[PDB]
Amino acid sequence: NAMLLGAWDNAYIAAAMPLLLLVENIRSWPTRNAAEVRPPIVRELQYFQQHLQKKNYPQEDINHLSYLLCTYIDGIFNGNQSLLVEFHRDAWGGEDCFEHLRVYMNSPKQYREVLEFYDLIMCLGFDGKYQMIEHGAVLLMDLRSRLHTQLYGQDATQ
Ligand SMILES: [Ca+2]
Fold first, then answer.
1. Is 142 annotated as contributing to ligand binding?
2. Separation of 80 CA from ligand 1 center, angstroms?
3. How far is the CA of 126 from the centre of ligand 1 (A)?
4. Rounded distance between C-alpha atoms, residue 114 and residue 128, angstroms
């Protein structure tokens, strides 16, 4: 229960929820149809950044969270033109995302809103590099438990 209640006031998560809902629908689309609806996904990504800059949120965190969104969506429709390349000039983010996350988890209370965002994205199935590491699921699930308890408590992790 802590995740839904805790994340409802999270301005980072709110600014990206339209895009997340749009993507959850497109996953049940033919692959060619998903490529045609890339302009609206690009629009939603631009709005995510524009809305948070309107709200004076730190640009370093907007970029990091946008980098994660492109990595998450690129991982859903792949395995042409990737979103991470267009927005951050990087072909693959499955490794850097967890290095961004490790720096945030070094300062838990200072970056609570950013950490809730990371918790949710991983809850939506993001795995990045852990998809190709041996025992990668065990390592990833352990990382989610350490972060989820850091945000919500032992009872929320179970
Ligand atoms: Ca909260």
1. no
2. 38
3. 21
4. 18
Cα 85 to ligand 1 centroid, rounded to whole Å = 32
* DSSP string for residues in the chain: -HHHHHHTT-HHHHHHHHHHHHHHHHTTS-HHHHHHTHHHHHHHHHHHHHHHHHTT--HHHHHHHHHHHHHHHHHHH-----HHHHHHS-S--TTHHHHHHHHHTTSTGGGHHHHHHHHHHHHTT--GGGGSSTTHHHHHHHHHHHHHHHHH-HHHH-
Query: At what angle are helices 59-77 and 112-123 packed, to 10 degrees?
Result: 0
How far is 151 from 156, CA to CA, in rounded Å? Answer: 9
Tell me the angle at which helices 11-26 and 112-123 cross, rounded to the nearest 10 degrees. Answer: 10
Tell whether 90 is in a known binding site. Answer: no
Distance 52 CA to ligand 1 centre (A): 17
Experimental method, per PDB record:
X-ray
Cα 86 versus chain centre, distance: 17
Compute the distance from residue 120 Cα to the ligand 1 centre, in Å: 12
Resolution in Å, one decimal, please.
2.2
